[PDB]
Each structure stands twice: as C-alpha cells, then as structure tokens.
Write a protein that binds this ligand. Structure first.
Ligand SMILES: Nc1ncnc2c1ncn2[C@@H]1O[C@H](COP(=O)(O)OP(=O)(O)CP(=O)(O)O)[C@@H](O)[C@H]1O
Length: 281
C-alpha cells in the first residue's frame, strides 16, 4: 500500500484508515477534531506516475512523468470544483480542498455502506426488481441534477455509486484525473468503461450518453454482466433484448426501460432522465 498511516495529521484532520486504494487515488476515513465529525479524504495518487517518499510526500517515479502528473492533478482539482457546485443528497458533498505533500486532497462527507459493485458481488440476493425500483428515483434525481446545470457524468458504472446503509445512492467520482492521464499517456484502457460507454463516447454527447451507461448498470444488476461493448455492437449488434431473455422475477416494464436506455444510437434512447423514468410507469 502507498497509503498514509492511521494517526497521520493534516492540522485538525486525522487519518483513521485507508478504505480505498486504486490506481489513481486513495480514499481515507478521517476525523475532523475541530468539528468532531468523521469525513472522507480523497488523495490524488497516480501509482503509474508517482510513489510515496520517506517523509510521506508524493514524488514522481521518473522526471518524464511530470507533465502528465500535473495534468491529472489539474483534472482532480476541476472535478472537485464541479462537485462543489452542488448540494444534493445523491452527489458527493465536498467540504474542503487543499494541496500538500506534492499532491492534492479533497475532504468530503463520509458515507455509510459500500459501492454498488461490492453489493452486487457480496449480496446479489438483495438485488431484485423491487430494490431496483427503490434505487431509481434518487439515482435519477442525482444524475438529472448534473444535467440541469449543463454537465454530464460520462463515467457511470457500478464502481462509483455508493449504496448507503439506508439504500440511498451517492455518485462518488467522475474519473476525471484517470481519464486525463489515460488520454495523455495513450493508455486508452483507463478512459472509457467497456460495456458502459455508448458509441458516441468513442469519438454527439448529451444526457442520452449517461442514460446508456445507467441502462448498462441496470443490465448488470439484472443478468450479472454488462451488455456487449458498444463499438462491437455498432458492427454487428449482438445485444439480445431483456424483454426476450425474460430473467426470472423481472417485469416487461422494467426490462423494456433498460432495453430502451441501451438503444445503440443516441436518438433512439430516452433523451432525458425524466423520459427514462416515465418508461417505468
Ligand atoms: N465519501 C466516501 N465515504 C465513504 N466511502 C467512500 C467515499 N468515497 C469513496 N469511498 C469508498 O472508497 C472505495 C474506493 O474504491 P477503490 O476501488 O479505489 O478501493 P478498494 O478496491 O481498495 C476498496 P473497494 O473493495 O470498496 O473498491 C470504495 O469502497 C468506496 O466505497
């Protein structure tokens, strides 16, 4: 692990545990001793470009990586600024941002529960049609809130949706720094998510782009895996409609909503979150 130790201090903040460690950042449970509350701290840390020094700052693995490391850092800052535009229960709430240790940190609300990806892996039996229909209103609301301010998410999958102990969802991360590093480094495999990204993301985009990814999430919950990669579909569409599979315990109404969200061409999908929600009625 490259993570700061339990007990490390950022003035009033104390690290408690590294709870997430991926290729591009570390997430810590932390504590604010001034306000006496638990928070999360997200630390930019691209492992392919940087390493942990003895004094616990971050340093480049090679001088040639500096330009890309800085561009990822700038994208991390821009994503924090985007999330700071909102005060919505389904969007990661940003408390503070600062630079230190050669990198940057976001202090955020700490959420109960775990990711949808982990829930689907650990407790698939909890995920049925009734549970999905309770998930959708607050998830629709969070995504639509982004859209109404003129932005798109563009990185939806199961990995970045938190399911709280209340079952309410939170969008945690837009992948901005990861995707910028991938574009600049020609590491194409870290930019789009296969099976979740629709055809128009491979090179126009709008609310329908996030709608397709949401359909791909729902498809994964219902049958266990995402639909075929969208470029492959654009050559020979092997997607078989869920209305035709008939997985046990799922209504044609929910199944056709997923199928419509997964229409290959943007114009054939629901055009807004509101349009997709109407399909379930
Ligand atoms: N604000 C927040 N509050 C609580 N948990 C958060 C959070 N932001 C991110 N997380 C958690 O951080 C983790 C980030 O995922 P990541 O893939 O980087 O780490 P990981 O694989 O080491 C642990 P996991 O098995 O959950 O994925 C997820 O478990 C997510 O639930």
């Amino acid at each position: 692990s490259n993570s700061l130790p339990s007990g490390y201090r950022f003035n009033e903040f104390e690290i408690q545990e590294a709870i997430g460690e991926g290729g591009f950042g570390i997430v810590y449970r932390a504590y604010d001793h001034q306000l006496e509350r638990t928070i999360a701290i997200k630390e930019y840390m691209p492992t392919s470009l940087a390493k942990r020094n003895d004094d616990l700052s971050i340093g480049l693995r090679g001088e040639r990586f500096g330009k890309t490391f800085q561009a990822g850092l700038n994208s991390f800052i821009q994503e924090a600024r985007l999330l700071a535009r909102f005060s919505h229960p389904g969007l990661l709430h940003v408390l503070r941002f600062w630079e230190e240790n050669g990198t940057a940190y976001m202090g955020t609300q700490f959420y109960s529960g775990t990711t949808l990806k982990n829930l689907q892996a650990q407790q698939p039996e909890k995920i049925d049609e009734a549970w999905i229909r309770r998930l959708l209103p607050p998830l629709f609301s969070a995504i639509n809130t982004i859209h109404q301010e003129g932005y798109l998410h563009r990185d939806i999958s199961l990995d970045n949706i938190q399911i709280q102990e209340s079952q309410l969802p939170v969008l945690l991360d837009f992948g901005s720094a990861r995707k910028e590093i991938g574009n600049l480094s020609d590491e194409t495999e870290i930019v789009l998510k296969p099976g979740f990204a629709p055809i128009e993301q491979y090179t126009e985009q709008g609310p329908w782009t996030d709608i397709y990814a949401l359909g791909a999430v729902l498809h994964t919950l219902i049958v266990g895996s995402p639909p075929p990669v969208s470029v492959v579909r654009s050559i020979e569409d092997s997607y078989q409609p869920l209305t035709e599979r008939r997985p046990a315990g799922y209504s044609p109404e929910l199944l056709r909503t997923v199928d419509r969200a997964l229409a290959l061409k943007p114009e054939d999908r629901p055009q807004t979150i509101d349009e997709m929600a109407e399909l379930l009625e």
